[PDB]
């Protein structure tokens, strides 16, 4: 299964200014590494995916919470 040449990438370029309460956040996923400026991406209910700067503790706590339950 020869790996692809140099697959583009899917890293965040901007973060949302509004923190969507847990109720509208059932899952999440992390960007990548091929970008020297990654971040955490959270899923919702009526949208899809939205980047989030991990610089905010609330984002770190939201991830930690999703890690348990």
């Amino acid at each position: 299964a020869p790996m692809g040449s140099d697959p583009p990438t899917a890293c965040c370029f901007s973060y949302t200014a509004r923190k969507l309460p847990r109720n509208f956040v059932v899952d999440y996923y992390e960007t990548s590494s091929l970008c020297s400026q990654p971040a955490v991406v959270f899923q919702t209910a009526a949208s899809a995916q939205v980047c989030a700067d991990p610089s905010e503790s609330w984002v770190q706590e939201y991830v930690y919470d999703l890690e348990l339950n």
Binding site: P7, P8, T9, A10, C12, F13, S14, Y15, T16, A17, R18, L20, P21, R22, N23, F24, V41, T44, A45, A46, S47, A48, Q49, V50, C51, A52
Partner: protein, 242 residues
């Protein structure tokens, strides 16, 4: 065309006369460039599905008949659209931003456009009016979301011979405000993707209530830069996808 019974105060009829009031509207631009490898597909306006978390349409809001302490609500939920077309799917998701009743798309070469915005007074749809305080507040919280992917729906297009309703707002250069939130794109089906936004009175600019934002994605190259997005795309080739 029949009938004629119709007032004139209705914001849908014409602009208001309340000095301290101006119908604020949103208008985003999207110039997507396909990669030189993605099959051909100019069947824009494939379809669109509006959704609103909790806001729905009546008045349930999840229907949480059990108080205790939680009060996260406060701010209104979010509204997103799944406008499929051009062999791609551009997912929206605005929050605390003027309602969007205008949706159109077009295909030219290996690129495809998409204009989402609100309607200007005297058009045929609503046009909620608000004060300067409520406006200045919105322009601050208003945050858009984007997440384009790669579609393959060869289904036909569903357009309407009805001209595209504009917000009467231009895309010139004005004050800068961070509106565009997250912007994830699977380059696997999009080489370059430009974005431009601008919220302001759709009746008569007011400078203060006028702002804008926009980036420039070109083969992985992203860069912020305010510029005259007045011609970013031919608004004359836009067709309503209804």
């Amino acid at each position: 065309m029949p009938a004629s019974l119709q007032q004139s105060s209705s914001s849908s009829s014409s602009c208001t006369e309340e000095e301290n009031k101006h119908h604020m509207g949103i208008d985003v631009i999207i110039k997507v460039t396909k990669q030189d490898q993605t099959p051909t597909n100019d069947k824009i306006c494939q379809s669109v599905t509006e959704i609103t978390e909790s806001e729905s349409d009546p008045d349930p809001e999840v229907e949480s008949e059990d108080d205790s302490t939680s009060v996260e609500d406060v701010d209104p939920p979010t509204t997103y659209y799944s406008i499929i077309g051009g062999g791609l799917r551009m997912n929206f998701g605005f929050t605390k931003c003027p309602q969007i009743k205008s949706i159109s798309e077009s295909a030219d070469g290996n690129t495809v456009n998409a204009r989402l915005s609100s309607v200007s007074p005297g058009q045929g749809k609503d046009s909620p009016a608000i004060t300067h305080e409520e406006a200045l507040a919105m322009i601050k919280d208003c945050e858009v979301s984007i997440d384009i992917r790669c579609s393959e729906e060869e289904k036909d297009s569903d357009i309407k011979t009805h001209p595209v309703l504009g917000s009467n707002i231009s895309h010139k250069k004005v004050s800068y405000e961070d509106i565009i939130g997250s912007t994830i794109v699977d380059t696997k089906c999009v080489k370059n993707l430009e974005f431009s936004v601008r919220i302001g009175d759709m009746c008569k600019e007011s400078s203060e209530l006028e702002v804008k934002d926009g980036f420039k994605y070109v083969d992985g190259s992203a860069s912020k830069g305010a510029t005259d997005d007045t011609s970013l795309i031919d608004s004359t080739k836009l067709k309503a996808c209804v």
